[PDB]
Amino acid sequence: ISKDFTNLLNTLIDGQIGAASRQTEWFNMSPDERTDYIKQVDERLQEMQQSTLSVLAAQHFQMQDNPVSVGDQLQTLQKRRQQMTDVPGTPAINAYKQQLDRDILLYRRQQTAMTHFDSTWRKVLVMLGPDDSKPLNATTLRENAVDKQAKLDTEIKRLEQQLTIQVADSTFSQKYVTLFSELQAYKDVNARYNALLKASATEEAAALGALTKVPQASDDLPVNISLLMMEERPGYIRMNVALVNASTDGRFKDFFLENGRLVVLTDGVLNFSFGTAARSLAWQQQYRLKSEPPSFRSPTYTPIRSVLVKTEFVEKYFANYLVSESTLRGGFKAQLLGNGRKMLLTSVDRKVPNQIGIQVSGQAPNTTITREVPLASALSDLINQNADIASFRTIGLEGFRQSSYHPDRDGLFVNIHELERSVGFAGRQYLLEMPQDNDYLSATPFGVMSVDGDKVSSSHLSKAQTDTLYQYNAAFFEKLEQLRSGGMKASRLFEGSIERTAFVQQLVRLLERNHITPAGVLAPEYPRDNMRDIKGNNLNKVLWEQAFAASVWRSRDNDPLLFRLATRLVKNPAVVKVLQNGYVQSDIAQARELLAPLYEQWRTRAVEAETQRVASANAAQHPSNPKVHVFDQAEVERSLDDKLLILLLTGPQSLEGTDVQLRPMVEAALLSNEGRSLRKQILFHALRPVADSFSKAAAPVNPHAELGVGKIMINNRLNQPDPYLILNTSSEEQAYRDGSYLIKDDKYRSYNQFRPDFKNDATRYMNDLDTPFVGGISGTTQTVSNVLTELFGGALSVKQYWQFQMANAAFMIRNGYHSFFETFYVAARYEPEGADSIGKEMLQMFDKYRVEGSKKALQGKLYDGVMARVLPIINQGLSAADEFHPPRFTRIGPRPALLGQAVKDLPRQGSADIHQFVTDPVLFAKTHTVSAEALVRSGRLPAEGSAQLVKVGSGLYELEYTEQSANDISSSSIPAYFLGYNGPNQANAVPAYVDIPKRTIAGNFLFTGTLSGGSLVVTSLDANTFRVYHDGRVNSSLLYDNVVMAVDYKDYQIAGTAEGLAAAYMQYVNHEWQLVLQRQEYQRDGQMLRLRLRDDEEPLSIQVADSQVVERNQAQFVAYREQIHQQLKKVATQFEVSISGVSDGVYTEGEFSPDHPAIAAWAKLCAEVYDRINADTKQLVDKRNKLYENRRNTIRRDLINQQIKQLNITLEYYKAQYDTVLREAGFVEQSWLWQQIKAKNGSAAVVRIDDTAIQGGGKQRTDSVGERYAISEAYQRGARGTGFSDGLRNFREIEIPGVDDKMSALEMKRLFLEGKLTSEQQGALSGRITETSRAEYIDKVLRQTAVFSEDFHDAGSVFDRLVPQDFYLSLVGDRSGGRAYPLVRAMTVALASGGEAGINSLVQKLFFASADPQAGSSTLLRNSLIKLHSNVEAVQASTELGQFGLSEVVSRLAATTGTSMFALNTQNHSMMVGSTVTTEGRRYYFYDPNVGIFAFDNTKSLSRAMEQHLVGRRLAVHYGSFGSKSAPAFNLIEIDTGKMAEVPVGNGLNVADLTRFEELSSVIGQRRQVEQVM
């Protein structure tokens, strides 16, 4: 809370960053992350105070010998409290008191219950016994039976009744405990009495014993009283059941709420448990009680499902099980449920009482044979009867979803959240400081951490050490507690104080000692390449290396080599040495589980050997010793593990004898994924001792000059074991005993023993490359790779070598033994000499990148540099469908691959609410937002198809077109008629239309793409059919004739704005079509966007067919045009522009045009009044750029950042106030022009039936075939009768004249744009085009994105950003080639207006929009790059210069002055090229949308790069450039960034607006927040 504490944290943060070397756990944060970090700092400091210093207080106190006794627990605790009621208040003290108090309450309750139980037992024995005239004996008890059994029953009934009434009591109470104890005593004594009556003469004495044996020793409780102590509220126990994982897909056992009922996901679960631990293991050891065995806590670690359940149910079946005392139980008990079902109870733990394996089973419902089967539904219903429906909960569920989100990764931890989720967790143990040694050291409350190069240990604290540690740490924490509240005034840590500096010097080492550092706790969603992991390695490189290791590990590709290796290797005697390794014994333990039936059969053999041991010991002559007359556990266990090892190395073919009968089972096991992974993870461990056993000397075959010739500088480690990462992984509780201990060697210890030696040259080299570091250059990999020719017994092919060597590198990364680099370096040093060897290059490439990394962030360039050289050697034999490809490195975290195995088989499902929508479409449309986006990003929708909804959010559904039949109603789909989307260009003469029956039978709905600046017009074509037109012009309803229904822009326009958005569709209802309009908007909702129904007006409105609609609109349009001319006259007067002579020129002649003389006065007036504000705002635009240039380059972001916000607010006022006016003036002018053209020349001049009568704004515009095709496949103009869909569905059977499979994609695109073929032929040719196109894009570009990065690098580039291969503007058609033409037009605005920061922001936007393809922003972006394919405003921003050879283009750039940009718009594709010259010299840029954007300092370098790229690798021929193969010719188009920036892309966004440093939800927020608010 205190500002002073916040300033202190900011001070040490900034200072600790400034002190950083490379490789540090601090890094610079976002100014939002800053706050999340500080929040977690404060929270975890409070956790320390309550949960470790408090327990230390409980040992500085209690040092004096109070009365202590294991029996007088209550009294011991009571006096420990009265010892300390005098102690001053302090959070560690308060937490200690409160813990001791709650334990006092529990022990008091238990002691009360046990007392009243015993008194009741004695009372009932007196009641059942004879009068004092006789001794208590079985005879008199038998004589009493007929009366006093009924008396016992009567009392039991009375007690049960009274207790059931008392269960209405709101909390545990003396009466409740009393009655419960009485009931248990009566029940148990009744049972024992009846057993005595049933006891035989031989049992009678034992049953009388069991009656006289009162549990008065109190050595264990009555079971039901233990359950009483487990009750969470009187009459209820908390049940829980623990998941393997949250089972969203059914892979795991689960128990979850579904429709208010609780539901077990599977028919029985081994993982139930009851109750909850009374205290943490820390307190458990502080009381020095027995801790609960770890087999309760070990088996799972993910969120847990729990509810309160009625104690009677628990005590009926499960008290038979739940006793902690060793009552005889087998593996199982089967319990008859009253419905005739079984419940099976399973001894899933042989020691712990309160965790249970449970199964319900019974006669299979509705079956021909009475087989009993398990029944999850029966268990669910029985629980729902016995459960409370209230206070079901899942423990930690939000914590999981806010830190892991899902089962995150197949590799080691990266931050403490992933550590704490991992299987190694048990409980968060903070360490604290023991500073009274000469230098500071780390201690637990129980012990100080002894550390050694080999070993880490604790010596338990003697009293003087506890007094030191407590008094010091408490003195520090008291200061911290003061600073949060009394501030600097209280704490006296004034800015000049030496005490302040000492204090900070202590806090910083506290925050390092515990990994509360930023790299420890932030765990972001998408990792900026700045961020660093818990060891200070670069975060993104670690994530990528983990995803690489996983992908290599999962492929089935290398297995024929590795298992050949294993089959040979197993014959060496040294392999036995592998088994006594400590780490191998982690995982062969899992093999004992996987092969359990065989392993059991083996052990049943092995236990025979004991009999031969004892026999041999007796056969020895006159044995003076039981020489081996013993069961040697270690002998059998060794022999068994050795057998399991051999059966894992050599295949199941090794099975022999009777076990061949089980061999089909073993074969089925070992080929599982879990089988293969274990079967090789034991192999690589087995490899090391064998390699060592040859002792062949080191002899690398490739020399390297930079790092010492002839040797390697292996290992390169400093041993500096981290104590926190050790103790926060499960050591044995022997550490917790308050006794000195040596900690286990878990596998992670290999991850935690080592730290880089900054003095060594190899470290200096690696720190120049800035690889991750883990344990240095792998001398192990040297020792292995030196002898491969002897392990395999012959030379490897470079293919076989690189296969083995990549699998080994994956094994090393997977187990956390080394980095990628730490292995591949020695591989490249050891790669065999040979015609295809590649290590020489790889070394030179490392050196080349070293001399860079000392200066620049390599951002993964190294990994691509390696994979470019390895992959074509690995994949050398394979088909393109079967090649291996690793995940691809990116600025965002590593994304999945796009080729080969990773895709092979590795649509949205839709929701049945479609039937509700069908049932009441009006109510549905009133209550849910129906969006249409997928009806925009599909072109060429059929005339007839299946329509379905998909749910996306709360009341939010999307339509999709689909091919699935409605006769699978599970498709959630119905017959409907679609209408294609028409384009946004106001020059369009050819609207989209389709014809549908009056009195339809075939289908009852019609859908269209989202309306944004267009009209839906319904007209009556004849007696029986409507023609429905989607026209892309505003106000189009005025232009057609015989209009019977229409929705124009004005009907859904937000008044006083350019903004509008609406879904429109048609429905056949009450025997007539109804035009249904659902007005929408985009709205901001917590740094995201969503659609919603518009709430400021009726979201739905409806027209039946009408006649007067034309007149009704026309009057409105005339008035509105007059009114907007008033608006513009006003504003122009406000800026002093002369309106004289501005009026409509009488339309005399000619086609539609912008800047036609008739409107020229209005257009000029707009253009000028716009200039009067555009020049004005530019003065702030420059200032804003100056600001962003200082924001990127300074520490104190939040100082100046708000100024950005205020300048934005200022500008957006001007936009909101005047852009709307100018836009509306343009629209009303284009509309009046088109109306004049109709009025003079008739509708046939203003609507055309098809586009084949080629004409436009000029007689030809020489648009590339690529562009004119993409336009022809992202808008519908003309109808699409079924023939086109039939051709598309049959396109592999159909044949087309003058086409063959070896035509280029270009020559097909051309012939398709000839339009001469039938619709069935055009459908087939379209399909053939898309198939050929993506086959070529795969073969030419995705498979070679690696080498281009390196060509641009060593041609000399000075900045680069790869762009996502994956971002597509349409899921259908040619995905590859359609995005190029809009993207270059956006990018050139970005670059001209914001330089390298613009390019960064835009590529970030593309990345997010490809990672989350269905988030609101990624939809809006896709819907806003479309509408740049043919927007005539973009043609206003163009000038098609001639063809040029590349050299001339370069010379032209050299000739340019000031910023200038050019597209190349090659015949089938569009690179971009251009220059900026403002400062930092002249930088020349090049951009290929299939690869990335690159920059250069000099035109010589630029041409040297661009030639290599376009001709050196022949891509100019794949892009179909003009003229000769050598010296290709390109068009070029001198884009005017002054005008291109301002083209409308719908929803009121200028392209600049999508092209900006903020997120779209920011800009839209600012608009709503300054327009509608204020």
Author numbering: 4 to 909, 924 to 1591
Which sentences did the original study use to describe this structure?
The bacterial Makes caterpillars floppy 1 (Mcf1) toxin promotes apoptosis in insects, leading to loss of body turgor and death. The structure reveals that Mcf1 is divided into an N-terminal head region and a C-terminal tail region. The head contains an N-terminal effector domain (NED), an activator-binding domain (ABD), and a protease effector domain (PED). The tail consists of two putative translocation and three putative receptor-binding domains.
To test the role of the C-terminal region of Mcf1 in the autoprocessing reaction, we purified a Mcf1 mutant devoid of 15 C-terminal amino acids (Δ15C) and incubated it with Arf3 in vitro. Strikingly, the autocleavage reaction proceeded several times faster than with the wild-type toxin and yielded the same fragments. This result demonstrates that the C-terminus of Mcf1 is a potential regulatory element that prevents autoprocessing of Mcf1 prior to its translocation into the target cell. To decipher the molecular mechanism of the activation process, we analyzed the Mcf1-Arf3 interaction by cryo-EM and single particle analysis. To obtain a stable complex, we used the C1397A Δ15C variant of Mcf1 to make sure that the protease is inactive and the C-terminus does not interfere with the interaction (see above) and determined structures of the Mcf1 variant in the absence and presence of Arf3. During particle selection and 2D classification, we noticed in both datasets that the Mcf1 head domain was clearly visible, while the tail domain was absent in most 2D classes or blurry in others. This is in contrast to the single particle analysis of the wild type and suggests, that the removal of the last 15 amino acids destabilizes the neck regions leading to a high flexibility between the head and tail. Therefore, we only concentrated on the heads for the following analysis. During 3D refinement and classification, we noticed that the heads were also very heterogenous and the ABD was missing in most classes of Mcf1C1397A Δ15C. Nevertheless, we managed to determine a cryo-EM structure of the complete head of Mcf1C1397A Δ15C in absence of Arf3 at 3.5 Å resolution. The comparison of the Mcf1C1397A Δ15C-Arf3 structure with Mcf1C1397A Δ15C, however, showed that the position of the protease domain is not altered and the cleavable linker is more or less in the same position, indicating that Arf3 binding does not induce direct conformational changes.
